[PDB]
């Protein structure tokens, strides 16, 4: 089972200049809760952006080039990435835009954070067919002293 997890600002913006230009500790905490103890697949630019392994998860990096860090697993295709996860119940695809596009056809489940923020982007989440997906969980949070936008956790499952 393949799932995508991502946080989307207005217009599906997910990144700018190889970062997320927001700061929402509560969303990072949701990301960790939903990924811990599962393998995470990411593209090389997202690997660079995070800048270090995510602990407690098997980190699998897609790149056409040989790997440059043996603390993580490097693979050269979608199918190799999936195989490197092994017999696991749930594989978490953690981006970025190019990787999300490739895994979205195989995915059964999306974990999307909808952030009420206007930010210029150079990377987007795929323009996914909404009719394909059932919303099974929604949880809205107002901004607070730690989280300077409102945000909504959503889980969708392919119908």
Ligand X SMILES: Nc1nc(=O)c2nc(CNc3ccc(C(=O)N[C@@H](CCC(=O)O)C(=O)O)cc3)cnc2[nH]1
Report the interface residues with ligand NAP, using CB under 6 A. Answer: 6-7, 14-15, 18-20, 42-46, 49, 62-65, 76-78, 94-99, 102, 123
User: Which partner, ligand X, ligand NAP, Mn ion, none, binds residue 98 by CB below 5 to 8 Å per kind?
Assistant: ligand NAP
User: Which partner, ligand X, ligand NAP, Mn ion, none, binds residue 116 by CB below 5 to 8 Å per kind?
Assistant: Mn ion
User: Which partner, Mn ion, ligand X, ligand NAP, none, binds residue 43 by CB below 5 to 8 Å per kind?
Assistant: ligand NAP
Token pair recorded at residue 48? 């660079």
| Alpha carbons 42 and 74: distance in angstroms, whole number | 10
Token pair recorded at residue 33? 């809760």
Chain residues binding ligand X by CB under 6 A are: 5-7, 20, 25, 27-32, 46, 50, 54, 94-95, 113
Find, among 74, 80, 91, the residue nearest to 37 by Cα.
91
3-state helix, strand, coil in the chain (%, to 5): 25, 35, 45
The residue among 7 and 54 lying less far from ligand NAP, judged by its C-beta, is: 7
| Alpha carbons 125 and 26: distance in angstroms, whole number | 20
The residue among 62 and 94 lying less far from ligand X, judged by its C-beta, is: 94
């Amino acid at each position: 089972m393949i799932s995508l997890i991502a946080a989307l600002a207005v217009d599906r913006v997910i990144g700018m200049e190889n970062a997320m230009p927001w700061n929402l500790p509560a969303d990072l905490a949701w990301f960790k809760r939903n990924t811990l103890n599962k393998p995470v697949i990411m593209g090389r630019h997202t690997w660079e952006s995070i800048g270090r392994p995510l602990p407690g998860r098997k980190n699998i990096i897609l790149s056409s080039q040989p790997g440059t860090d043996d603390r993580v697993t490097w693979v050269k295709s979608v199918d190799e990435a999936i195989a490197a996860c092994g017999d696991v119940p749930e594989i978490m695809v953690i981006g970025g835009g190019r990787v999300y596009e490739q895994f979205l056809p195989k995915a059964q489940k999306l974990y999307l954070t909808h952030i009420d923020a206007e930010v210029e982007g150079d990377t987007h989440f795929p323009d996914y067919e909404p009719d394909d997906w059932e919303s099974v969980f929604s949880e809205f949070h107002d901004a607070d002293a730690q989280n300077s936008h409102s945000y909504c956790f959503e889980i969708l499952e392919r119908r």
